[PDB]
Design an enzyme around this catalytic site. Sequence first.
Site, short mmCIF file in Angstrom:
data_model
loop_
_atom_site.label_atom_id
_atom_site.label_comp_id
_atom_site.label_asym_id
_atom_site.label_seq_id
_atom_site.Cartn_x
_atom_site.Cartn_y
_atom_site.Cartn_z
CB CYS A 163 -0.89 0.04 1.23
SG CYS A 163 -1.49 -1.56 1.79
CG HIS A 303 -2.92 4.14 5.10
ND1 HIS A 303 -2.81 3.96 3.73
CD2 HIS A 303 -3.01 2.90 5.64
CE1 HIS A 303 -2.81 2.66 3.47
NE2 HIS A 303 -2.95 2.01 4.61
CD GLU A 314 -3.56 7.57 8.88
OE1 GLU A 314 -4.36 6.72 8.44
OE2 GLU A 314 -2.94 8.35 8.14
CE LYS A 336 -5.88 4.19 1.05
NZ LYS A 336 -5.06 5.33 1.55
CG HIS A 341 -6.28 0.60 0.16
ND1 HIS A 341 -5.22 1.30 -0.39
CD2 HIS A 341 -5.74 -0.24 1.07
CE1 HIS A 341 -4.10 0.90 0.16
NE2 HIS A 341 -4.38 -0.04 1.04
CG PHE A 401 -0.96 -5.25 3.47
CD1 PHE A 401 -2.03 -4.90 4.30
CD2 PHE A 401 -1.12 -5.16 2.06
CE1 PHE A 401 -3.24 -4.49 3.74
CE2 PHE A 401 -2.33 -4.76 1.51
CZ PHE A 401 -3.39 -4.42 2.35
#
Lengths: 413, 412
Positions: A163, A303, A314, A336, A341, A401
């Site tokens: 990502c 994110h 976050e 997003k 995403h 990830f």
Amino acid sequence: SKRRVVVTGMGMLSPVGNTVESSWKALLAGQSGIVNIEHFDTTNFSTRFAGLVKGFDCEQYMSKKDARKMDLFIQYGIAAGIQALEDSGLEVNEENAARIGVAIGSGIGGLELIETGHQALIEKGPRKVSPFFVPSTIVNMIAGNLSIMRGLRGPNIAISTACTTGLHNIGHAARMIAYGDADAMVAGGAEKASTPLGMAGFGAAKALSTRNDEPQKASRPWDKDRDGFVLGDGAGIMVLEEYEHAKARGAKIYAEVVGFGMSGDAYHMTSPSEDGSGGALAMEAAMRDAGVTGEQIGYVNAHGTSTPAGDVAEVKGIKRALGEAGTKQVLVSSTKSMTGHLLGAAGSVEAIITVMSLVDQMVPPTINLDNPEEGLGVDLVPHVARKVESMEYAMCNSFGFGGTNGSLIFKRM
Amino acid sequence: KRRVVVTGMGMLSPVGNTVESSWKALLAGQSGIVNIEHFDTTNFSTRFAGLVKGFDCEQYMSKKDARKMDLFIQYGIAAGIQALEDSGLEVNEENAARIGVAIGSGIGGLELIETGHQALIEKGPRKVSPFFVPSTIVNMIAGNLSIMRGLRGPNIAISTACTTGLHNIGHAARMIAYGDADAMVAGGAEKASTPLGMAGFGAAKALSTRNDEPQKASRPWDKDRDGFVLGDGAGIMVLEEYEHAKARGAKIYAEVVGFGMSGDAYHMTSPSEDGSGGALAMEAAMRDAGVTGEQIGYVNAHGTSTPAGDVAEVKGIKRALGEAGTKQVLVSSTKSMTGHLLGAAGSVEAIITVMSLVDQMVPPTINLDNPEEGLGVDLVPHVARKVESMEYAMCNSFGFGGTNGSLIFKRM
């Protein structure tokens, strides 16, 4: 010189538009790009919707003959890359080819042609796998193809960090310009993982929202009812350029790249530090790189993927990194909520978004934020765009990830 | 300026499961190429590969955990733990944020990809492993090693096909020098010797098809070469800022002094006929390091045993080094023994290059029975060669799409 780096071209394919301008207009209007998957039978898939690129026409950039040698992720990346180069007005000739490079990656690469190749192997045997199997699917071939098509002979790399891919490619393209390896770079990421194996893979991890009955409401970062991320496809690409070189040709300069920070959660294969401390480390490093304090950052494109664990962590990281005063004056949103995403493209698309916010002094909203978690202490720009005043710096986060984190800080020009 | 040195090395290769065993084997001219026995190769045009022998994951992790990881990741983790241990680097709360990872793969988890797709197709979406994604994607060597070892510094994975391992080391060095970290664990791994991998490279006709003599198949610069030999493995270095290493008493193998990159911009699978792309990367590395051709004693070539590739590289080397440099240099391809390790090629070969500086000894290009006429270079055919006062050595990797890189290391 201490070499500075600026953005002089942008290019984009996204679920809400096929150019930067169309995508940005749509985002400011709060439009969702999430739709049902129509192109394969989603019947026993636990998630049946995705952010898809609409009306993509490769022939605008290359022949159908050539496109056949490329998975869609590569076609998407090439398209956004050509857009960016043309937007930059940069001229490529024999004299300077060696000084213009590429840094473009993908998280997963050519899943569709991978599936197709494996099918052929299994049904028809090894000698019936396409001769283009490898170059059509591997993640470095956006950079490979675009360099070939455009005569770019400078550093040629591809960062693949799930990502965070798009963000890391841009960051390191900037690093390489600053170091002296190149005077310009075409940088970013692309993905097209909305395939059977991709949807099943993320499905089996139970990472995806399963709100199949209301796809446009599925992505709802920080909302109490969020239930995992929404997968999207696309490409985001920037042309980066050494500042003196750009000034000397009088280029339009959208922004300056002033900070790039990286870290690792070192926590778990799929969930974030509950602290948010990994994210904070990357933001803190970006801030130190740029020489700025929290108060100087007007906007964070988070994110914010709409996961239970992720979204909250976050916010903790952002508060730590920015400090109390910084936190009070900052706006934070997750686009997003509209795009989904975009995986490998997430970071580059969002970097473009972050740059546009500086350009227009305007921040896009987090849509679907109907019932926020209690006790977040930040303005998450719910529902509707928000105007800003004298925002000189904005920040983009991507946290992927394996705990791989990155932040970019851009400065208004 | 922050300098960068190599303080740990780790390796899995077709000729050994440690750096020392691999190096001893390479100096002795041993081949690691063997017939494939782990799937039925009956209709495959190429039936051999450089395989890692006797790999035991259990000294690094349980079968339950290994089950969440393709072999490319297990290989990378293994070489990474070797390297960390070789380095003696201590990781605690105070410094975790300053120790990072840069490790990639060219293709990643093909076996588990095949397996997952099979499951999807035979049994449906609910039968795909919950670990499908993290078990297969290329950044998860860096992810898993960071998690297992508490490494919280910059975490990246460069995936540039055959140049992967080299680029990860180069950029790890760049990041240390820039100040983002004080140490990095860096390199690449690959395990593409699977049915889809062998068929994929087979269909492109990129592989040698000398099935009757697997150990003779890889013959860089030999008139009879007919494509590359695929190999599996992992190569990893611990890099660290020089003051930090000196201050703790680290053994220092070598210093990273030059890193250069370029793109051929020529063709998706064949190199600039010029060799000019390669030359640009070598030239940039030389400038980065501040050295002339004469100062480079050894080039560990890309030399994959392709007709087009091998010759072009020699042109690039001669251009980059100049006449005088070319006369005093030795050049070899260890792919003659290991095969082409793809994502691991560059990091394994960087380790080889370092060891050549350490031992003042260059490994041979085996199988070089009948060289192309008019190469103007000593290609160290057949047997190792001793060198005198070699202060710098260079490693090249030039991958698919035209992505090129060179590293220059300096003797301490």
